[PDB]
Design a binder for this molecule. Sequence first.
Ligand SMILES: Nc1nc2c(ncn2[C@@H]2O[C@H](COP(=O)(O)OP(=O)(O)OP(=O)(O)O)[C@@H](O)[C@H]2O)c(=O)[nH]1
Ligand SMILES: [Mg+2]
Length: 167
Amino acid sequence: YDYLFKLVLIGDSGVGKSNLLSRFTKNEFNLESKSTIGVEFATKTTKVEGKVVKAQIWDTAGKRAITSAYYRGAVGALLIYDVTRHATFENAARWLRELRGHTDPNIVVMLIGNKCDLRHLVAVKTEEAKAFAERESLYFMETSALDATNVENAFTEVLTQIHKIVS
Ligand SMILES: Nc1nc2c(ncn2[C@@H]2O[C@H](COP(=O)(O)OP(=O)(O)OP(=O)(O)O)[C@@H](O)[C@H]2O)c(=O)[nH]1
Ligand SMILES: [Mg+2]
């Protein structure tokens, strides 16, 4: 734990939060996936622009005054929606204002369109998502936990920019 960056994943149920966490930390995809009970953790150590960082990534259910303990100390946040279900992207702003009720204004937040491997079912055009990120100063990437496309880039990018702030 040279420096340990706590990151929280948030977003509605079944957007792929847990599988995202699984593919980044252990490189595996839980097909047999159940809704997350409580909060689960997973760490990974990587070196961002030349300084070894430990990420300590928190995960919970999309569904208890545990929110404050959930967000406490988070210096990063992945706002995940499900590219194929427009209702997941719509209440991302509602996750966003909860995430800013319980964190610092300078947290590094990436909006994430997960499941980009389901190309024939995409219900969210990337320019409405890019518009929402522009409007809110969010980073943004499309990802597939199933294919691993952009998962590492999503996390390391967050980690790198966290590093630039506190370095
Ligand atoms: N095709 C495809 N399916 C995915 C992808 N990521 C997740 N899924 C599926 O979507 C379902 C939800 O996965 P989870 O990671 O458990 O969903 P979640 O966001 O963690 O939901 P909660 O933990 O209950 O809040 C699972 O059945 C996955 O198989 C993806 O990238 N591509
Ligand atoms: Mg889960």
